Amino acid sequence: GKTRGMGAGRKLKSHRRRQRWADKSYKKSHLGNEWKKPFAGSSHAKGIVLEKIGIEAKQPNSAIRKCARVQLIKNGKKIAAFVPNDGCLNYIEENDEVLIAGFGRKGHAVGDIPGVRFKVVKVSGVSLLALFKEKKEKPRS
Amino acid sequence: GGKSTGFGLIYDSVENAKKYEPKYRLIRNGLDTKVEKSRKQMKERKNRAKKVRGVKKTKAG
Amino acid sequence: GSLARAGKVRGQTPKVAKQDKKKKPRGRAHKRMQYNRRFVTRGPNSSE
Amino acid sequence: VHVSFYRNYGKTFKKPRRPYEKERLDAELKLVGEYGLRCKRELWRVQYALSRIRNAARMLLTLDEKDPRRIFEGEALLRRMNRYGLLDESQNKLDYVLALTVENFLERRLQTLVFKTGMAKSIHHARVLIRQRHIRVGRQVVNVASFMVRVDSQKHIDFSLTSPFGGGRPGRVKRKNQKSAAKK
Amino acid sequence: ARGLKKHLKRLNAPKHWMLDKLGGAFAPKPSSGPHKSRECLPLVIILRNRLKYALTYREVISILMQRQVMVDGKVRTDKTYPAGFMDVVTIPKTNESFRLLYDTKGRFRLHSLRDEEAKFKLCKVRSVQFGQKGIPYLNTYDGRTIRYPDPLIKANDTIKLDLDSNKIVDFIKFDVGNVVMVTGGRNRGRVGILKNREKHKGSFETVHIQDSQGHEFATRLGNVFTLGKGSKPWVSLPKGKGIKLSIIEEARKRMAAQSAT
RNA sequence: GUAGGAUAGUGGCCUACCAUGGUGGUGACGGGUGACGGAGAAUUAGGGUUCGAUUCCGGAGAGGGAGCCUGAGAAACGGCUACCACAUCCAAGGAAGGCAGCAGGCGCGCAAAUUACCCAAUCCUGACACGGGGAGGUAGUGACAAUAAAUAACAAUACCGGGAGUCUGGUAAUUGGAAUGAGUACAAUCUAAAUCCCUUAACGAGGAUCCAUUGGAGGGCAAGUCUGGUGCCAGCAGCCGCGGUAAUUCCAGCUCCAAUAGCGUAAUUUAAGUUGUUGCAGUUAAAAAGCUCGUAGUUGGACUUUGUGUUACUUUGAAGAAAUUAGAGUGCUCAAAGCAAGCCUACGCUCUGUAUACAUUAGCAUGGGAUAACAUUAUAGGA
Ligand SMILES: [K+]
Ligand SMILES: [K+]
Ligand SMILES: [K+]
Ligand SMILES: [K+]
Ligand SMILES: [K+]
Ligand SMILES: [K+]
Ligand SMILES: [K+]
Ligand SMILES: [K+]
Ligand SMILES: [Mg+2]
Ligand SMILES: [Mg+2]
Ligand SMILES: [Mg+2]
Ligand SMILES: [Mg+2]
Ligand SMILES: [Mg+2]
Ligand SMILES: [Mg+2]
Ligand SMILES: [Mg+2]
Ligand SMILES: [Mg+2]
Ligand SMILES: [Mg+2]
Ligand SMILES: [Mg+2]
Ligand SMILES: [Mg+2]
Ligand SMILES: [Mg+2]
Ligand SMILES: [Mg+2]
Ligand SMILES: [Mg+2]
Ligand SMILES: [Mg+2]
Ligand SMILES: [Mg+2]
Ligand SMILES: [Mg+2]
Ligand SMILES: [Mg+2]
Ligand SMILES: [Mg+2]
Ligand SMILES: [Mg+2]
Ligand SMILES: [Mg+2]
Ligand SMILES: [Mg+2]
Ligand SMILES: [Mg+2]
Ligand SMILES: [Mg+2]
Ligand SMILES: [Mg+2]
Ligand SMILES: [Mg+2]
Ligand SMILES: [Mg+2]
Structure with a gap:
C-alpha cells in the first residue's frame, strides 16, 4: 500500500514525479515534441496551396472530401487542410495564401476524413465563411 | 442638472495674483497674453544651435 | 477523387428570396412577449 | 509606466454551467418577465451579488461566536442588509442572511419600487420612465433601473423637477402638437 | 543601478503618507537629512496634503522660497526636507506651530502647539x-x-x-517605569509605561509596554522613545493620548456620533 | 594552511611555499528549459493544478566580445579604444556609425496603434522660485479586457382566453394622442490649448427603414416527425451518426430555440477519486519482482508524579513593502471604480477619513511538556 510515514515526504513526492509520466496528457505537454508539429505550438498558420486534392471518406461513409495540400510559410512543412462547406473548393486556387487552423481535436483526426487534422479558414486574406455567404469576394480578376 | 461645483480663489490684490497665479489662469482672466510657440520647433533649433560655437549660434538659421 | 462535382447540390438548389416581415422587438420588449407566450397564454414549433 | 494601469476592474456575473437545462430556463424567464429585466445577464449579476453576501456569512458562521472578527464583520454585514431593506430588525442574526433569495434583491430595485409605489402602471412602464429621466431619488435624478434603493431613501422617490410629470414643461411631442394647433 | 536612485515611485512610497495611487506615477523622494526617508514627512506633503496651504507641487516651492517655513527653528527651503518625529514646524505668518507626532494608527499628526511649548x-x-x-x-x-x-x-x-x-x-534615563511612545512597527504611535526589558545577548532587546488601560504590547528597543519620567510625558500628546482602540470600540463611537451628530 | 601582493575592504581574489583535501542516491557532476527571480495571475468545497515577457521590488543587457577614461558613484554605451559582424557618406585622400528611449519603417510572423500636442498635473534635475524633461501627462488609433445601459411605453378598438354574465389578462405594418435619447446644434462648461463627458435654446420617431446580431432546431442539448431541392452525390457531423428517390441531420424557404451588443471557430484550469497527501488501482478488466538475503531509506511494544543533554511539536508575541486578495467607512446618479467626503452657511467646522485581517517555509523571542526523535546509564571521572 501507500507509504504513510511522517518522514516519508521525499518518497511520496518522487514517486508521483515518476508516475505522472504514465499519464498521456501530462507526457504530451512536457515531452517537448509539440514544437516539432507543423504548427510548432501555434494556433493558426499561413501557407501556400500546392494542389487541390480529394480524399476518400472513411467507412461506412462514402464521399470525396475536398482538401488542399498546403506548405507552411514559416517552416516549409506540407499538410493536408480540409476545405469545409459546399463548393468552397472553387474559391481556392493553387499557389494561393491560405490561413490554416486546427480541426478541433488538438492534432487528432476528425470525422470520417482519414489523416486530416487541419482546415482552411481564409483564402487570399478573406474568410471562407464570407465567400460562402457572398459577403465578400476574393481580391482578383 | 441644476447644480454645479467648482473651486475659487480670491487674492488680496491683482499684484499678489500675478506672483502666485499660474500663467494659464492669468490669460483666462485677461491679466496676461499668450505667447504662441511650437515646442518641437524649439527643440530642433536647440539641436541646430549646438553645432556652432560663439556668437554665430544665434545667427544659425 | 474527382473534384469536378464540388458545389454540385448548392448550385442545383433553386433560389428563393426571403420574405420581408415586420421585425420583432429587441431587448426587454422581446423578453416580454417571450414571457407572455409561455406563462400568460405540443412544442413551440410543432407542426399543428 | 501608465498610472491608468493601476485602476481596478472586475466581473459582475457568471454564466450557468449547464446552458440548456429546461427547469432553469423556465425559472429564469419567470423572474425576467416578472421584473421586466433586459436579459439573463441582469438576473445573473444579482445571483452573483447574492452569492458573495451568502459566502461572507458562511465564513463568519464557521468561526466562534466570541471571535472578534465574527462580531465586527457580522454586525457590519447585518447593518448593510438592514440599510437596503433586505433584512428586518427582528432578523439580526447571520443565519437569516443565508435565507436571502434573488427576489429580495430584485424587490429593492428602483424599477420595482417605482412600479409598486404606484408611480408606474406596469413593471415595464417603470423601466422606460427611469431611463427617460423622469424619476429622482431625493434631489438626484436617477436613470439606472438597477439602482438599489435604501430604506432611508424609499420615501423620497418622486418625479424629477425637470420632467413633464414633476412640474416641468411638457415634452417636445406635446409642444409641437400645441404649436401645430396654434398655426391652425 | 550604477549609482543613487533619485526617483520614488508612488506605490513604493511609505503607506503612512496616505498618497492616492492614481494621483501620479511618482511621489516626493525625501532628501537626505536628520531622519530616515521611511520615517519622515517631507515638507511638500505637510504643506499641500496635510495643511492644504499649497494646491500643487509648484505652490509649495513658492511658500518655501519666501522663507515662511521653519523646522527646529531654522528656515528650510528644500521641498523634500525630511521632517520627522518630534520636529517642530513653525509658520510665523499664520502664527502656527506644530509638532510631528504619531497618531494611534501610526501616521504623522500635525499637533498644534502653544508658543511656549514650541521652544524645545x-x-x-x-x-x-x-x-x-x-x-x-x-x-x-x-x-x-x-x-x-x-x-x-x-x-x-x-x-x-x-x-x-x-x-x-x-x-531622562531609559529605565522601567517611564512613559514611552512607540515610533516604529505595528504598535507605532502607542503610549504606555515601560514595564520590562528582556535582553538577549547578540540579539535585539525586547521591551514590554503596558497601556494605561492595561493592554500590554511588546516591541524592539529601537522603536521606543521615552517621553517623560514616571508617568507624565514632557510633551503634549494628541487627543487619543496613545490609546489604541479596537475596531469594535471604534465602530461603537462612530455609531454614537451619528446619533448625536 | 603560512607569508606576501592587490583591493574601498573580507576572501585562492592573485603569487610563493606546504598539506591532500572538497562534493556526491538527503542525486554531486552533466544535460534540458519555447527558464530572468519575486510581489503576484487563472481556476479553486478542501487539498490542488497551471501560469508569472510586461507598469512595484531585485538582477541583467544595450549588435557580439574585451579594454578603459572621467568621476563621490560607470567596467557607462543617446562616453571613449580595439577586434569581429553589419552598414552610411566621399571629390575615393578620408570620415562618421549603434532605436531592447518616443514615434516611425523594413523584415519576421496567427499576432500588436500617431513619424500628434504639452510641461498644466505627478515628480526629477541644473548655478536655478524662472530653464529642461518622448520621464510623465493629453488627445488620436483601439469589440485585449471590464462597467452601466437604448432598440419602445400607454390607452382605445377588433380578435382570443381565464376567473349566459361581466371583471381581468394576451395578440394586430389597426387607430390615437404622450414620453424620450441616438443624432444635430446657440451656448456655457471642460482643457496648458483643444476634444469627449456632464448641463442646456432650437431641431430630432410609426413599418418609431432610428430595420440586432451570432450560432443552432436527431441525441448528448433548449428548439420542426413543416415545405421545396439533392439521391452514399454534394455535403453535414467535436462524439454517436445523417445522406443509396417519401432526408426531423445536407442545400434552401418558413417557423422555432439559446445568448444578445454581442456571438462563433482554432494553450491551459475545471470536470479528474482518469496522478489519488486529503483520495485511486494491481485474483480474473492495465498492474505483485521466480525466490530469499541485504545497506541506505522509511517504520518500530510496554514502563518513570498521580491523587543547565540536544530537538521536533504547540501557544503567544515581535518583525515584517506597497499594489493585488479579504475587509471597515463613504449614494462617483447606479455600477466596475475611486479615496474620497460630511456638516452647517462662517471668512468656518468635524484633532474629518484614508480602519483591520491574512501573509507557506526558514530565522528571532516567551509559555506548555502530552506525543515523538536523538544522546546518555554499573570498575559512576556520580550527587
Ligand atoms: K500525489
Ligand atoms: K549596483
Ligand atoms: K581583500
Ligand atoms: K591563504
Ligand atoms: K561628480
Ligand atoms: K511639469
Ligand atoms: K525647477
Ligand atoms: K475526500
Ligand atoms: Mg494496510
Ligand atoms: Mg535605471
Ligand atoms: Mg549586533
Ligand atoms: Mg592574506
Ligand atoms: Mg600557487
Ligand atoms: Mg518562470
Ligand atoms: Mg531566455
Ligand atoms: Mg516577471
Ligand atoms: Mg523569452
Ligand atoms: Mg512592452
Ligand atoms: Mg524593472
Ligand atoms: Mg550596464
Ligand atoms: Mg538590435
Ligand atoms: Mg559597454
Ligand atoms: Mg539609443
Ligand atoms: Mg543609458
Ligand atoms: Mg491584437
Ligand atoms: Mg438598430
Ligand atoms: Mg434546416
Ligand atoms: Mg430537446
Ligand atoms: Mg424534403
Ligand atoms: Mg445536430
Ligand atoms: Mg487518463
Ligand atoms: Mg482507475
Ligand atoms: Mg487476459
Ligand atoms: Mg491482467
Ligand atoms: Mg513506543
Whole structure:
C-alpha cells in the first residue's frame, strides 16, 4: 500500500514525479515534441496551396472530401487542410495564401476524413465563411 | 442638472495674483497674453544651435 | 477523387428570396412577449 | 509606466454551467418577465451579488461566536442588509442572511419600487420612465433601473423637477402638437 | 543601478503618507537629512496634503522660497526636507506651530502647539563616545551631535533640547517605569509605561509596554522613545493620548456620533 | 594552511611555499528549459493544478566580445579604444556609425496603434522660485479586457382566453394622442490649448427603414416527425451518426430555440477519486519482482508524579513593502471604480477619513511538556 510515514515526504513526492509520466496528457505537454508539429505550438498558420486534392471518406461513409495540400510559410512543412462547406473548393486556387487552423481535436483526426487534422479558414486574406455567404469576394480578376 | 461645483480663489490684490497665479489662469482672466510657440520647433533649433560655437549660434538659421 | 462535382447540390438548389416581415422587438420588449407566450397564454414549433 | 494601469476592474456575473437545462430556463424567464429585466445577464449579476453576501456569512458562521472578527464583520454585514431593506430588525442574526433569495434583491430595485409605489402602471412602464429621466431619488435624478434603493431613501422617490410629470414643461411631442394647433 | 536612485515611485512610497495611487506615477523622494526617508514627512506633503496651504507641487516651492517655513527653528527651503518625529514646524505668518507626532494608527499628526511649548524638542540618544582630542560627545537619532554632554547621559536616553540655546536642558534615563511612545512597527504611535526589558545577548532587546488601560504590547528597543519620567510625558500628546482602540470600540463611537451628530 | 601582493575592504581574489583535501542516491557532476527571480495571475468545497515577457521590488543587457577614461558613484554605451559582424557618406585622400528611449519603417510572423500636442498635473534635475524633461501627462488609433445601459411605453378598438354574465389578462405594418435619447446644434462648461463627458435654446420617431446580431432546431442539448431541392452525390457531423428517390441531420424557404451588443471557430484550469497527501488501482478488466538475503531509506511494544543533554511539536508575541486578495467607512446618479467626503452657511467646522485581517517555509523571542526523535546509564571521572 501507500507509504504513510511522517518522514516519508521525499518518497511520496518522487514517486508521483515518476508516475505522472504514465499519464498521456501530462507526457504530451512536457515531452517537448509539440514544437516539432507543423504548427510548432501555434494556433493558426499561413501557407501556400500546392494542389487541390480529394480524399476518400472513411467507412461506412462514402464521399470525396475536398482538401488542399498546403506548405507552411514559416517552416516549409506540407499538410493536408480540409476545405469545409459546399463548393468552397472553387474559391481556392493553387499557389494561393491560405490561413490554416486546427480541426478541433488538438492534432487528432476528425470525422470520417482519414489523416486530416487541419482546415482552411481564409483564402487570399478573406474568410471562407464570407465567400460562402457572398459577403465578400476574393481580391482578383 | 441644476447644480454645479467648482473651486475659487480670491487674492488680496491683482499684484499678489500675478506672483502666485499660474500663467494659464492669468490669460483666462485677461491679466496676461499668450505667447504662441511650437515646442518641437524649439527643440530642433536647440539641436541646430549646438553645432556652432560663439556668437554665430544665434545667427544659425 | 474527382473534384469536378464540388458545389454540385448548392448550385442545383433553386433560389428563393426571403420574405420581408415586420421585425420583432429587441431587448426587454422581446423578453416580454417571450414571457407572455409561455406563462400568460405540443412544442413551440410543432407542426399543428 | 501608465498610472491608468493601476485602476481596478472586475466581473459582475457568471454564466450557468449547464446552458440548456429546461427547469432553469423556465425559472429564469419567470423572474425576467416578472421584473421586466433586459436579459439573463441582469438576473445573473444579482445571483452573483447574492452569492458573495451568502459566502461572507458562511465564513463568519464557521468561526466562534466570541471571535472578534465574527462580531465586527457580522454586525457590519447585518447593518448593510438592514440599510437596503433586505433584512428586518427582528432578523439580526447571520443565519437569516443565508435565507436571502434573488427576489429580495430584485424587490429593492428602483424599477420595482417605482412600479409598486404606484408611480408606474406596469413593471415595464417603470423601466422606460427611469431611463427617460423622469424619476429622482431625493434631489438626484436617477436613470439606472438597477439602482438599489435604501430604506432611508424609499420615501423620497418622486418625479424629477425637470420632467413633464414633476412640474416641468411638457415634452417636445406635446409642444409641437400645441404649436401645430396654434398655426391652425 | 550604477549609482543613487533619485526617483520614488508612488506605490513604493511609505503607506503612512496616505498618497492616492492614481494621483501620479511618482511621489516626493525625501532628501537626505536628520531622519530616515521611511520615517519622515517631507515638507511638500505637510504643506499641500496635510495643511492644504499649497494646491500643487509648484505652490509649495513658492511658500518655501519666501522663507515662511521653519523646522527646529531654522528656515528650510528644500521641498523634500525630511521632517520627522518630534520636529517642530513653525509658520510665523499664520502664527502656527506644530509638532510631528504619531497618531494611534501610526501616521504623522500635525499637533498644534502653544508658543511656549514650541521652544524645545525631545531627542533620543544614539550613542556616547570620545571624539578627537578625547572630547566626549553624543549623537541622537535626529542627526544632531552634542559635545560635552552630561556624564550621566547614556545610550537610549532622551534629552530635552532647547531650540534657541541649542543645549541640553534636561534628560531622562531609559529605565522601567517611564512613559514611552512607540515610533516604529505595528504598535507605532502607542503610549504606555515601560514595564520590562528582556535582553538577549547578540540579539535585539525586547521591551514590554503596558497601556494605561492595561493592554500590554511588546516591541524592539529601537522603536521606543521615552517621553517623560514616571508617568507624565514632557510633551503634549494628541487627543487619543496613545490609546489604541479596537475596531469594535471604534465602530461603537462612530455609531454614537451619528446619533448625536 | 603560512607569508606576501592587490583591493574601498573580507576572501585562492592573485603569487610563493606546504598539506591532500572538497562534493556526491538527503542525486554531486552533466544535460534540458519555447527558464530572468519575486510581489503576484487563472481556476479553486478542501487539498490542488497551471501560469508569472510586461507598469512595484531585485538582477541583467544595450549588435557580439574585451579594454578603459572621467568621476563621490560607470567596467557607462543617446562616453571613449580595439577586434569581429553589419552598414552610411566621399571629390575615393578620408570620415562618421549603434532605436531592447518616443514615434516611425523594413523584415519576421496567427499576432500588436500617431513619424500628434504639452510641461498644466505627478515628480526629477541644473548655478536655478524662472530653464529642461518622448520621464510623465493629453488627445488620436483601439469589440485585449471590464462597467452601466437604448432598440419602445400607454390607452382605445377588433380578435382570443381565464376567473349566459361581466371583471381581468394576451395578440394586430389597426387607430390615437404622450414620453424620450441616438443624432444635430446657440451656448456655457471642460482643457496648458483643444476634444469627449456632464448641463442646456432650437431641431430630432410609426413599418418609431432610428430595420440586432451570432450560432443552432436527431441525441448528448433548449428548439420542426413543416415545405421545396439533392439521391452514399454534394455535403453535414467535436462524439454517436445523417445522406443509396417519401432526408426531423445536407442545400434552401418558413417557423422555432439559446445568448444578445454581442456571438462563433482554432494553450491551459475545471470536470479528474482518469496522478489519488486529503483520495485511486494491481485474483480474473492495465498492474505483485521466480525466490530469499541485504545497506541506505522509511517504520518500530510496554514502563518513570498521580491523587543547565540536544530537538521536533504547540501557544503567544515581535518583525515584517506597497499594489493585488479579504475587509471597515463613504449614494462617483447606479455600477466596475475611486479615496474620497460630511456638516452647517462662517471668512468656518468635524484633532474629518484614508480602519483591520491574512501573509507557506526558514530565522528571532516567551509559555506548555502530552506525543515523538536523538544522546546518555554499573570498575559512576556520580550527587
Ligand atoms: K500525489
Ligand atoms: K549596483
Ligand atoms: K581583500
Ligand atoms: K591563504
Ligand atoms: K561628480
Ligand atoms: K511639469
Ligand atoms: K525647477
Ligand atoms: K475526500
Ligand atoms: Mg494496510
Ligand atoms: Mg535605471
Ligand atoms: Mg549586533
Ligand atoms: Mg592574506
Ligand atoms: Mg600557487
Ligand atoms: Mg518562470
Ligand atoms: Mg531566455
Ligand atoms: Mg516577471
Ligand atoms: Mg523569452
Ligand atoms: Mg512592452
Ligand atoms: Mg524593472
Ligand atoms: Mg550596464
Ligand atoms: Mg538590435
Ligand atoms: Mg559597454
Ligand atoms: Mg539609443
Ligand atoms: Mg543609458
Ligand atoms: Mg491584437
Ligand atoms: Mg438598430
Ligand atoms: Mg434546416
Ligand atoms: Mg430537446
Ligand atoms: Mg424534403
Ligand atoms: Mg445536430
Ligand atoms: Mg487518463
Ligand atoms: Mg482507475
Ligand atoms: Mg487476459
Ligand atoms: Mg491482467
Ligand atoms: Mg513506543
